[PDB]
Tab-separated table of C-alpha atoms in Angstrom:
chain	number	residue	atom	x	y	z
P	1	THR	CA	-3.410	-31.261	-19.679
P	2	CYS	CA	-3.190	-28.477	-17.043
P	3	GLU	CA	-5.933	-26.571	-18.946
P	4	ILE	CA	-7.436	-25.432	-15.629
P	5	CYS	CA	-4.647	-27.116	-13.598
P	6	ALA	CA	-6.951	-30.154	-13.665
P	7	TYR	CA	-4.486	-32.793	-12.391
P	8	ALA	CA	-2.672	-32.863	-9.011
P	9	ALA	CA	0.557	-32.962	-11.087
P	10	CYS	CA	-0.231	-29.338	-12.103
P	11	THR	CA	1.723	-27.735	-9.239
P	12	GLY	CA	2.309	-23.971	-8.842
P	13	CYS	CA	-1.493	-23.833	-9.005
């Protein structure tokens, strides 16, 4: 999912 931190959910990024 967070392959390139694609989604807003992908925090830290």
